Ligand binder design. Structure first.
Ligand SMILES: NC(=O)c1ccc[n+]([C@@H]2O[C@H](COP(=O)([O-])OP(=O)(O)OC[C@H]3O[C@@H](n4cnc5c(N)ncnc54)[C@H](OP(=O)(O)O)[C@@H]3O)[C@@H](O)[C@H]2O)c1
Ligand SMILES: O=C1C[C@@H](c2ccc(O)c(O)c2)Oc2cc(O)cc(O)c21
Length: 324
């Protein structure tokens, strides 16, 4: 069957396309710019690309731009999203196109008549952005927008756009009887096929690069392997019993435990031993994937698997130095 993957050039998007083509799907992959060789070469080099992959030019900012790609598809994976954390105009450059792009794709789907299920890749930032952290989060939990806008932590604008897009999407879905599923990943770590630094790995490997601004996301961190996440996407698209939101998260630990793991695996890098405002008594915060595992889904990868995959790929591609 024929599925549309939005944001196919990205970290998650490109791996998903790979796994979909591997599974025998016909894939329509969207990108903003098909003349960009660094964005498309990795898609075209995929096994089955010549015969089973087409590229479509589309932007979330343009009304109706996903109309042609979606017509004829039996499913849609909406993975694309504005990823700028440092935007000087957050409302127009990030928040607004995320929500209207999302609703636009849902309408593009309704207009197609062929789409049997829309799978939206949401974000853990729609779940646990509040002042007090619960010990365990599930699918009933939503982020606090007032707190998010006021605190203005790293990625606040991104957290707001994702939260607002998902809530708007559920409203549209309930009112128009659209078979709609969302997947909520935590921090996605692993090897990848794209040629530039995946945004999440800026966060995940902060302990190695010393990027302190990203510490706030991993302070009480939750993680999932790229390949487990993409298999969860395919699983929930194919599983007829699937409904509502699904958390997809396999591990949790505080920055201290993560930095420990990395020092032990990578002695060549300068990884801190102490982090300001963080003690051994800091509670680990868990995202519960029980709804997903209850369906029959199995995670296959460990925290060590994720990070070795990520660092090894970064090295291979010259995105991390060999040592410090
Ligand atoms: N990775 C994680 O840790 C993580 C965790 C939770 C949720 N997520 C979600 O997973 C999805 C993919 O994340 P990612 O890590 O793969 O990020 P990524 O590498 O930045 O991929 C995002 C893709 O979106 C596309 N895009 C950006 N702006 C667009 C626009 N205005 N119109 C159309 N496409 C646009 C870009 O493709 P082009 O530049 O080629 O057009 C980019 O390749 C996002 O929805 C994100 O919210 C990611
Ligand atoms: O989309 C995400 C997930 C996000 C995150 C992970 C775990 C949490 O508890 C949480 O509130 C948010 O962190 C990210 C960091 C990035 O650099 C890129 C992302 O897409 C994300």
């Amino acid at each position: 069957e024929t599925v549309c993957v939005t944001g196919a050039s990205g970290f998650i998007g490109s791996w998903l396309v790979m796994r979909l083509l591997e599974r025998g799907y016909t894939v329509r992959a969207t990108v903003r710019d098909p003349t960009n060789v660094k964005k498309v070469k990795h898609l075209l080099d995929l096994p089955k690309a010549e015969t089973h992959l087409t590229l479509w030019k589309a932007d979330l900012a343009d009304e109706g731009s996903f109309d042609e790609a979606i017509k004829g598809c039996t499913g849609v994976f909406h993975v694309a999203t504005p990823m700028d954390f440092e935007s000087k105009d957050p409302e127009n450059e990030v928040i607004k196109p995320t929500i209207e792009g999302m609703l636009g794709i849902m309408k593009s789907c309704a207009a197609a008549k062929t789409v049997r299920r829309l799978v939206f890749t949401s974000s853990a930032g729609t779940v646990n952005i509040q002042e007090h952290q619960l010990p365990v989060y599930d699918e009933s939990c939503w982020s606090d927008m007032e707190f998010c806008r006021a605190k203005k932590m790293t990625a606040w604008m991104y957290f707001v756009s994702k939260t607002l897009a998902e809530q708007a999407a559920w409203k549209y879905a309930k009112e128009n009887n659209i078979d709609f599923i969302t997947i909520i990943p935590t921090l996605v770590v692993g090897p990848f096929i794209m040629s530039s630094m995946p945004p999440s790995l800026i966060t995940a490997l902060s302990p190695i690069t010393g990027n302190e601004a990203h510490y706030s996301i991993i302070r009480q961190g939750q993680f999932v392997h790229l390949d487990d996440l993409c298999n969860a996407h395919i699983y929930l698209f194919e599983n007829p019993k699937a409904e509502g939101r699904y958390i997809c998260s396999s591990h949790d630990c505080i920055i201290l435990d993560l930095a420990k793991m990395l020092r032990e695996k990578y002695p060549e890098y300068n990884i801190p031993t102490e982090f300001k405002g963080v003690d051994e008594n800091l509670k680990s915060v868990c995202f519960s994937s029980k709804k997903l595992t209850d369906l029959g889904f199995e995670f296959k990868y460990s925290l060590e698997d994720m990070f070795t995959g990520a660092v090894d790929t970064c090295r291979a591609k010259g995105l991390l130095p060999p040592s410090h």
